[PDB]
């Protein structure tokens, strides 16, 4: 399971997350050319690796769509992380330590969301 | 950071987390020997370095107990995940999604964690 994106994978998903339509290799390459000089095959290859990581889907003139949005990807990584805990006791303790390590704004965002979740 | 441990440091911490009682250098060495051929001094030395990092405590038989439990590794993995967010806006939206994604038992665990933080 992916736990972080490399800088080129991130450049890539950043373009994809900025467009509603699935994008061709050529379109991603043109976006990345703003800061990098890359081979077309390098952009192609990174798309394919991101597809193998289920972060994009190849649509068929091949186009690529992000499987998760920017925010939902982060949320999913957090879920994947909590899933590492061995049992409900350590999930509980993990969550205690987790909220100690986020900011207040973050802790409150959690509080607000939880209160909406139920009521 | 538990999430940033070297591979041998992690192998040791894994063993210690797997056992209720503090473990001798011999016990750690025997446990690691299933997957590696290491010198006794190598294990002893990594325990010493972990101790200087405050990740284990030597208990006087000389034995070693983990200072932080594996639930703190899980919390760290969550912190690292949240850190993948590109800015505060995305950071807050990901937490909302997280709360939306978790099970009810986890939400309730989260509620308990935030109450403790609150106290
Ligand atoms: Cl290249
Ligand atoms: Cl755990
Ligand atoms: Cl060795």
Curated annotation (Swiss-Prot), chains A, B:
A single GO BP: negative regulation of DNA-templated transcription
Protein modification: Upon exposure to beta-lactams, proteolytic cleavage at a single site may impair dimerization and abolish repressor activity.
Expression induction or repression: Autoregulated. Up-regulated by amoxicillin.
Signal sequence region: none
Keywords associated with the record: Antibiotic resistance, Cytoplasm, DNA-binding, Repressor, Transcription, Transcription regulation
Chief place where the protein resides: cytoplasm
Gene3D superfamilies in UniProt: 6.10.140.850, Winged helix-like DNA-binding domain superfamily/Winged helix DNA-binding domain (1.10.10.10)
GO function terms (MF aspect): DNA binding
Protein's cellular compartments: Cytoplasm
Region of interest called Important for dimerization, as start-end residue ranges on this chain: 69-119
Residue(s) at site: Cleavage: 97-98
Protein family: Belongs to the BlaI transcriptional regulatory family.
Stated role: Transcription regulator that binds to an inverted DNA repeat with the consensus sequence 5'-TAC[GT]AC-NNNNN-GT[AC]GTA-3' and regulates genes involved in antibiotic transport, detoxification and cell wall function. Also regulates its own transcription. Binds DNA as a dimer.
Remarks, miscellaneous: Was identified as a high-confidence drug target.
Name this polypeptide is given: Transcriptional regulator BlaI
Organism in which the protein naturally occurs: Mycobacterium tuberculosis (strain ATCC 25618 / H37Rv)
């Amino acid at each position: 399971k992916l736990t972080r994106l490399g800088d080129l994978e991130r450049a890539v998903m950043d373009h994809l997350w900025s467009r509603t339509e699935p994008q061709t290799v050529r379109q991603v390459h043109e976006a990345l050319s703003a800061r990098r000089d890359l081979a077309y095959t390098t952009v192609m290859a990174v798309l394919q690796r991101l597809a193998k990581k289920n972060l994009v889907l190849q649509i068929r003139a091949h186009r690529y769509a992000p499987v998760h949005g920017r925010d939902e990807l982060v949320a999913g990584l957090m879920v994947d992380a909590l899933a590492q805990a061995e049992d409900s006791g350590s999930r509980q303790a993990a969550l205690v330590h987790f909220v100690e390590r986020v900011g207040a704004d973050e802790a409150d965002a959690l509080r607000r969301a939880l209160a909406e979740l139920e009521a």
